[PDB]
């Protein structure tokens, strides 16, 4: 009964070619999508926090240092999410004009997803650290960030008084 298995073999090899090509193309597209470089430079405070936890697990560091590290990490994360929320509208408005390719949009979506996952992980860790310490960390972080950037701006504007005094003494 070969006259019937020959067309059956034809169907088998056809569906097998379909399946293997689908798998190969899916794998290649996933690898090319994963080949996209990260959006923003590598986070630093997370590395410090993880290395501090590793040092604590090795031995005896007071947990107050860990709380300070988590506060700084939350401040960094809130600055990052403020930046991405500022950039989202401009990117969406610019994508229609065609001045930006789709790779940037894909990188932006992946970065937004990663940032959401990271902010969820850090707020869960914060909740695990202290009793009902979940949503106040972000208020503390935004206030710290605002006060820090304001103090930096004030110091920068203040530091340039010597040149002005010298110029005035010269013109006088």
């Amino acid at each position: 009964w070969l006259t019937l298995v020959v067309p059956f073999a034809y169907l088998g090899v056809l569906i097998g070619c379909l399946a293997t090509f689908s798998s190969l193309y899916r794998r290649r597209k996933a690898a090319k999508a994963a080949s996209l470089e990260p959006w923003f430079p590598p986070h630093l405070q997370r590395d410090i926090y993880h290395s501090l936890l590793h040092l604590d697990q090795q031995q005896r560091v007071p947990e107050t240092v860990l709380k300070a590290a988590l506060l700084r990490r939350a401040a960094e994360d809130i600055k990052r999410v403020m930046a991405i929320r500022e950039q989202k509208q401009a990117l969406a408005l610019l994508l229609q004009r065609g001045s930006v390719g789709d790779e940037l949009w894909q990188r932006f979506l992946r970065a937004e997803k990663e940032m959401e996952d990271e902010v969820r992980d850090v707020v869960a860790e914060a909740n695990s650290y202290a009793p009902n310490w979940g949503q106040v960390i972000f208020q503390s972080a935004r206030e710290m960030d605002a006060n820090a950037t304001y103090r930096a701006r004030m110091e920068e504007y203040q530091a340039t008084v010597a040149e002005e005094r010298a110029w005035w003494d010269k013109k006088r």
Partner: protein, 194 residues
């Protein structure tokens, strides 16, 4: 998925320190400054209270604000007395004390306080004929709070029109009018005499 950074805790001080080599001077100084600021925050939190948790920003401890207002009132009385040296000295002291406000607390209160103190010190410097210092103090004050700070814009424009650079004064008073009333009338009168 974390980049490992070998640290070393300092006993009896609880101040972390980067161990011997990020194998890169830029990364080295970056993480050095980062650990410095982290130790600073740790000192602040350990000086806060035995509970290391930072309090929420809803309530405001009024003792520091009361001290600032008291120092400002005494400095203002000393300035109105006639002296200006100790006046601006106490002004700068109150400015530093208000800048000593920690970061986790709200920023609007400290911003308004620094605006008022910088405007007062700029007025005092103008009384002292210190035109560049008064102008930069007025610029800092108006940078703190740009809305409703008509006195700051007026003092800045006056310092400018006094020390020259008439176009700078023109642009300054133009932005002032764009932001904007006795203050608006005074700004218009100052612009007319330019």
């Amino acid at each position: 998925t974390y980049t490992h950074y070998p640290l070393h805790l300092d006993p009896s001080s609880k101040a972390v320190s980067l161990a011997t080599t990020g194998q890169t001077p830029a990364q080295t100084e970056a993480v050095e400054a980062e650990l410095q600021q982290l130790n600073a925050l740790h000192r602040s939190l350990i000086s806060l209270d035995p509970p290391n948790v930072p309090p929420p920003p809803l309530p405001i401890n009024p003792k520091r604000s009361a001290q600032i207002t008291k120092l400002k009132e005494t400095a203002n009385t000393a300035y109105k007395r006639g002296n200006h040296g100790e006046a601006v000295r106490l002004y700068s002291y109150a400015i530093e004390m208000a800048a000593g406000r920690p970061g986790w607390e709200p920023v609007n209160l400290a911003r308004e306080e620094l605006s008022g103190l910088y405007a007062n010190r700029a007025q005092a410097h103008m009384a002292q004929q210190m035109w560049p210092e008064g102008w930069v103090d007025a610029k800092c004050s108006v940078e703190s709070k740009p809305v409703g700070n008509a006195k700051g814009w007026w003092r800045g424009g006056k310092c400018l029109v006094e020390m020259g650079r008439y176009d700078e004064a023109r642009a300054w008073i133009e932005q002032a009018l764009g932001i904007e009333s006795d203050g608006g009338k005074e700004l218009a009168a100052l612009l007319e005499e330019i």
